[PDB]
């Protein structure tokens, strides 16, 4: 069976500093939305 | 200096191009 | 009135607001203080009857 990703919320540590600051911003940046889902800490940020 | 011209405007409710 | 009766508001509507004549006269006051009543946008002969 083929590889597929099964994470609802990606962990904070495994996520890059680029995407980390995207989730923490009050507004997104066009063309730079992270593909991975947000983490659990930032669901009310 | 104000000049009202309802004739030719730009649709404020439609995107450009 | 829908909140005080149990219903659900339209989607994306943030839930005793002033009677309409109160909010209307708030609008007239805000303009009057900004224009000072000496303006031609306060012709009392036409605006008071309206």
């Amino acid at each position: 069976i083929i590889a597929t990703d099964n994470v609802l919320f990606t962990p904070r540590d495994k996520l890059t500093v680029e995407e980390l600051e995207q989730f923490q911003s009050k507004k997104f940046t066009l063309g730079k939305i992270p593909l991975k889902p947000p983490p659990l800490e930032l669901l009310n940020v | 200096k104000l000049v009202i011209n309802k004739d030719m405007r730009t649709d404020l409710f439609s995107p450009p191009n | 009135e829908i909140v005080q009766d149990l219903p659900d508001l339209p989607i994306a509507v943030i839930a005793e607001p002033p009677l309409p004549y109160v909010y209307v006269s708030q609008q007239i006051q805000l303009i009057a203080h900004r224009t000072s009543l000496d303006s031609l946008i306060f012709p009392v002969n036409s605006l008071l009857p309206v």
């Binding site: 994470v7 911003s25 507004k27 939305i33 992270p34 889902p37 | 995107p15 191009n17 | 994306a12």
Partner: protein, 313 residues
């Protein structure tokens, strides 16, 4: 999008390996078997739209039975797959494609039928993950906009071959229209947008969703980080958010609204430039759907969503 295209290729070439495993199925009785499996593996999916939820479990078990090895009633005589290794690999292929064909020739015409078909596809995917990879394989080829990836016009290959990549249905003679093609593409992702949010209730499943709602967040992110196509993007974006915007709002409270107060400011002006006034029908309704939701701060439940009343009567 190398990460996605690699995964895209895996499901594609891995389904092609399945195209090779049963080439022997391609005698007088051997043809009767092929039809009996192709028949007893696509009728049940066609009845999912036309049944009561109380009875909908009958089709799920009938698919699960036929596919797990047990026998199933097809016509008068009983059909089975036990000790039929090519018949087993043959039924998973036709089953996975029939789920997509139904999203192609029924969900396109009637948007409500996506949800009763999605729950059944979601439960079978859950019990048989190989069927799910075949479901993604056909969905991906027939609808590359669900990967998502926009195929580019290339030099060195014929034009007709390129139009098929875009998902245009072509007879040997000519290509299908655009209006009927946009409907086929819509219905296919409304089905997919329903699959990633619904879960088969019965069975007592310990584990996670097979193709979870996480794939719904990236899809929106992955099409908005690339330049939009003129008419497809504005259409498919709407009928995706209408189907899966509610389930995505609940899971990602603040991150989803940030993505929604973005399209209005940045991605919507982008669509106005690329599209002439003659075909603005996609972008114009993309805003009518939002303006309500934006001030309502809520996305309506998709019209046709399954409720508890459905599962009893």
């Amino acid at each position: 999008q190398d990460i996605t295209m690699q995964w895209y290729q895996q499901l594609q070439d891995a389904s092609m390996q399945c195209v090779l495993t049963f080439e022997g199925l391609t005698d007088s009785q051997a043809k009767k078997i092929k039809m009996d499996l192709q028949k007893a593996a696509t009728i049940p999916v066609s009845q999912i739209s036309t049944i009561a939820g109380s009875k909908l479990k009958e089709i799920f078990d009938k698919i699960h039975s036929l596919l797990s090895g047990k026998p199933v009633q097809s016509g008068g005589r009983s059909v089975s797959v036990t000790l039929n290794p090519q018949g087993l690999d043959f039924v998973q292929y036709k089953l996975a494609e029939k789920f997509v064909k139904q999203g192609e020739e029924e969900v396109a015409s009637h948007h409500e039928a996506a949800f009763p078909i999605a729950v059944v596809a979601s439960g079978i995917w859950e019990l048989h993950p190989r069927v799910g990879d075949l479901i993604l394989a056909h969905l991906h080829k027939k609808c590359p906009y669900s990967v998502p990836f926009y195929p580019t016009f290339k030099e060195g290959m014929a034009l007709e071959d390129y139009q098929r990549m875009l998902g245009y249905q072509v007879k040997d003679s000519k290509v299908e229209q655009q209006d009927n093609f946009l409907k086929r593409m819509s219905g296919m992702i409304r089905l997919y947008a329903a699959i990633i949010q619904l879960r088969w209730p019965y069975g007592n499943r310990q584990e996670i969703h097979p193709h979870g709602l996480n794939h719904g967040w990236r899809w929106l992110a992955q099409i908005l980080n690339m330049e939009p196509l003129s008419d497809v993007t504005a259409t498919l974006l709407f009928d995706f958010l209408e189907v899966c915007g509610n389930a995505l709002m609940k899971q990602y409270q603040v991150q989803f609204w940030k993505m929604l107060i973005l399209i209005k400011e940045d991605y919507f002006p982008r669509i106005e430039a690329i599209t002439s006034s003659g075909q603005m029908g996609s972008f114009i309704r993309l805003k009518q759907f939002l303006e309500k939701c934006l001030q309502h701060k809520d996305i309506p439940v998709p019209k046709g969503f399954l409720t508890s009343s459905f599962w009893r009567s």
